[PDB]
């Protein structure tokens, strides 16, 4: 489990944060911010000590720091640091890891 | 012409830009006279939506803190809660600012406010198309006018630095 | 667990695609695109990397990339790689392997 | 876990197939189709590999193909193959095997 | 688990305590008292004895008193001692550790 | 507590009204000396009173069908204040 | 398991009773009773054997007679002995001990 | 698919009345020589139809308002069977 400005998740989160918001089109058209919903690729930031819940020893998680990942739609808690929202997710919940 | 109420006739002068809508909160009475509230070099907002959140009001609330001038707020209208704010800085050390809805009816009210922004220098708030949201405002995206006074029934703004070819960009624009 | 174009799947997902929409009948006749649902039938395109939901050591997915499957009629998310829109289930959710 | 053509189900499933509309009656009198229901007795046409929720080592299907059994009401899953329509029950649902 | 003026929690439980409530603003300006909701970052005063749900040998409560945490939102049971209103979460509940 | 010990107590409602019975109530506060409760801007919140935040009058006669406040001591430049506001 | 005037709980339970109804105020005056809901911190009179549900051998109950608890909201049996109305609870139920 | 590979086709509603039109569409199909479908009272579901379970006339018309059908091949013996009927 590592942490981040005086700040730690406990036992199965993982803290991260959306890209950006991406405005303009890909070719020569721009986008309002009503529309585009929530940016679902997102970077974690920091991630929870590990899944205690596992029988005995606890369960390490797995996704680590610095990973690009496939968000969930509906669930996560939006957290604060800084004014910076960021958003915590629960282990289990991650979509899919943009390994490359 | 409107019908007199004395006995000789009257020729009155309507300047600056003046409306018959008043104060909403009687706290802002700063006049010490017949329901008045006098600021003196205030600055302006102008939102086209009403001022719902206290997130909303806040920052520029904080601007005009900071700068430490008197505030008008001429929006759609105002939130109690945002209004308890307003009060609260306001009986106590005072804040100067002043809450006002718009005059404009309805579409008369979307161009009404448009020209009393480009009359007082700024840019109205609460757009379709920018949509220039309330939480990112600049010391030059206030509304700024010479003098201002409110009753219960209108307010008059005097000396809005709006970039006199600008207004008569509008005249033009207006007038074909 | 195998990955895609810097994707992969969580601990039981399985990232497949849908066949063709099938818009011609098989002998004479053409079909339009708002009837015909969803083509059940799909090929696997990335799987996840196992079931760590099982005791100490982890489960690995069955169904092996490159297989076609009858898929559920609900289950699993829709994502997009590229433009192109592919669908992660679940491995318990697929319903046949079309094995041959 | 035995399959079909082309076809074969996952860890509990149970492809099977129930039997004729039964039109007429015993004696002499015919029934149209809108009553009679759906024939709730049926054959076994492909068994899934087995149960591996079984802790560890999977668990076998028990129900081998071939055989007769009493199928549940509800629950089954209307697949095709070869435009023949077959039921994909699964293993615990099964409520009685026709052995003789 | 360690316990306060006359009062234990009970094999999960953690009472805790809200910081201030934030009045003014950063800058310059005041806000009002039925606004700012409830200060959702808090010290924890008090800890439960550790979850005995575990199997065999109970499980000890991992935050230990004075420490910063991000709360829940909704669960939390309001207590009081002394007239001071201290709000009792779950183990599981807390959000994050404000470590440094 | 009034049948028995006898806590000396007394329940009336306001005048009843809108505007008027609020800004009725300020010049009671002010008359009485003390501090309205309930407001908006302020809203002095019952749970902390004080002995100085409370109406103090000489004497009150109360009928079932009006009530009659004598002597607030409210701080009668503060209430000369009061009177020419409202008189401009 | 200790027990009361013929009467003992089973396997989880709690019967225990709740302190004074608190009618005059601290300093000077005196309440009704339609207000002041009920006290929540109890005395526990008598105690259950133990939790049977623990696996093989079963768990001793914690909380032991002749304690000062806070009592939860809803869950609780309303109990009578003698007229003496007691309230049963559930062991997980208390949610704090007056430890001094 | 007609406006594109151009199967030709053409689509028209029954005539439009109670009894009557499931009567005319009865004479119809017996005219033209085929089957009615939809029947309630054996079944003739459309899934299982056949080449001589269709009705074929030498020509067909239609306009915005009405229809004509020409040279309906029904078993010139049964239509007259059908004419007895209902002139009986």
């Known amino acids: ?3 981040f400005r005086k700040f730690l998740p406990l036992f199965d989160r993982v803290l991260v944060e959306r890209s950006a918001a991406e405005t303009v089109t890909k070719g020569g058209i721009m986008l309002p911010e009503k529309s585009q919903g929530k940016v679902l690729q997102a970077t974690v ?9 596992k029988g005995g ?9 610095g990973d690009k990942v496939l968000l969930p739609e509906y669930g996560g808690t939006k ?4 004014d910076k929202d960021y958003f915590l997710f629960r282990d289990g919940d991650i979509l899919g890891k943009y390994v490359d | 012409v409107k019908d007199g109420k004395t006995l000789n006739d009257e020729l009155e002068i309507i300047e600056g830009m003046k409306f018959d809508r008043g104060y909403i909160s009687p706290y802002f009475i700063n006049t010490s006279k017949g329901q008045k509230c006098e600021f003196q070099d205030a600055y302006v907002l102008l939102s086209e939506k009403k001022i719902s959140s206290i997130q909303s009001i806040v920052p520029a609330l904080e601007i005009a803190n900071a700068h ?21 800085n306001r009986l106590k050390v ?6 006002v809805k718009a005059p404009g009816f309805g579409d008369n009210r979307k ?22 949201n309330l939480e990112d405002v600049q010391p030059h995206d206030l509304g700024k006018v010479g003098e201002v006074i409110v009753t219960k029934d209108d307010a008059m703004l005097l000396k809005g630095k709006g970039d ?9 624009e207006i007038i074909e």
């Open chain 1, 1 to 3: 489990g590592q942490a």
């Open chain 2, 68 to 88: 430490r001038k008197p505030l008008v707020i001429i929006a759609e209208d105002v939130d109690g809660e945002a209004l308890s704010t307003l009060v609260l």
């Open chain 2, 164 to 172: 006199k070819a600008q207004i008569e960009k509008r005249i033009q």
């Open chain 1, 57 to 65: 020893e606890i369960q390490p998680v797995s996704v680590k720091v």
């Open chain 2, 94 to 99: 005072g804040l100067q600012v002043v809450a």
């Open chain 1, 79 to 82: 957290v604060v640091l800084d």
């Open chain 2, 111 to 132: 161009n009404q406010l448009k020209d009393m922004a480009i009359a007082t220098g700024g840019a109205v708030f609460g757009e379709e198309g920018l949509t220039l």
């Open chain 1, 45 to 53: 930031v920091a991630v929870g000590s590990g899944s205690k819940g």
